[model samples]
Target: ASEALTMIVNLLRSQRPLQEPTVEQMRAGLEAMAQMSPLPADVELTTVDAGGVPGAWVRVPESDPDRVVLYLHGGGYVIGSIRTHRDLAQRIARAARCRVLLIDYRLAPEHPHPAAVEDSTRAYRWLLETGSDPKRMAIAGDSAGGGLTVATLVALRDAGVPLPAAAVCLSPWVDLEGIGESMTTKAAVDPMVQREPLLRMASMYLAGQDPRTPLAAPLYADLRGLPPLLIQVGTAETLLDDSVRLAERARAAGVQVTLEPWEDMIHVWQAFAAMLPEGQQAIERIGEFLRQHWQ
Candidate 1:
């Protein structure tokens, strides 16, 4: 690992477990932490109204105007917003040379399971209605947003809506049931996410819905006919098996899948691009993958 990565890992390990906080405090803390990295100088941000939901458009000078990456921010389906993920969205915009729409989807304990999915699908439909070609569009997200990426794709597929050209998942939390073996095996190595907190968030989001519902937890979804997918995960994350098994399931259903596990990295390390070189490298690789499929 790089020296910066080592420092980040230590810093993350030193932090207290995320638990028992008011939702307001958790949201504030995540927004504060998101400011650790500044957006690139060349990136420009513009506010957007995707149907009814709020969103922001991150654009770089090198970006292709017609090609857009619909980005979903992660905070366990409870916290996170365009403000919390703008820096990472800008980094992705720069790397992929495409505009990125970071949506502020409805949160849980208020909106619950189908709300986020409904908002995402509506946003994609709004994009399509505004003349953006589905072939020039891709979906990407991290953590819960990563799972939402897959869920949104699945929902669109089943609804008979045209799908995007490709998708990317960074440290996806696809299994709400929390059944992945890594949930136990990698517990000691992962400092950021704990099983109990996840279960709480899952319950809040599911709101009594089946945990295995395809839209709620895509690990149980039939992924046939989904677009090409690029899933990047940290080997040390408890969600490691979520990505690993998702790739296996997608491949079994004839979907093209690329799974990249970075050794020793933690969940959503791509958000630490300022401190860790590997984060930017991973985004660059995602750009390469998108370009390949775009061609």
Candidate 2:
């Protein structure tokens, strides 16, 4: 883990001076980078339509056919897709012993806010309609998708849709307003995320919508009556406060919340499982949390 962090930090530092590229360039770069991590041998990937949204299914040999996990990929709601998240979804599927559906939700500066949330909700509704029980299903995501996971749940609760058994957020970027103190305090240590680029992404995603709007930036949303939540964050990330404040608020709202802050880790470290042992450990903890809630 230490060596991985050092390499990542050096890479980020080397790329720091490059001029910001267009969203298309960013997306292409991320996709190419994602290709470096190979999927698990025991996992099968199959393309599917997630309630009218484009998506793929990740399943392992030991997966429970009846249990499902709806996974949302993170890319500031702009770049990520099923292709970028398939391996991570497969890891989650194997760890939790459940079938994983990774959705390719609409991006921002085009579809903007409400599009991703609408797509996620539609996917969940479709899963329930297709015979997946609410009590056996869960929602999970990293970064922006993590925020979307919470927003989707709140939207369902508001719309009177059946809630899932639990949810998980990894280094969630829940505050579109960028009010988290870590956004400034952790700036020097966090190698991947920076406030300026995130603010730019937030602007593209908001598209004139209020940042504090609950559905778009779930940090300000009413979290009451939500299902059990497992939030994992790294102490060294810029988004640390987002997870901390989210857990604090969720607990205050009478929700069951488990907040795990990994010391000396960077943002979404779990994504680097191929080279980082802590990544796999975090996913294993997620598996335990899911099983605890599902049972």
List model 2 lDDT by residue over 35-123, tens digit each: 88987678888888878998888899989998999999999988888888888898899889999989989999789998999999999
Task: Quote each prediction's TM-score.
Answer: 0.97, 0.96
Best-fitting candidate, scored by TM-score = 1
Per-model root-mean-square deviation over C-alphas:
1.2, 1.6
Q: Candidate 2: lDDT over CA atoms?
A: 0.89
TM-score of 1: 0.97
Which consecutive 10 residues in model 2 have the weakest lDDT in total?
Answer: 11-20
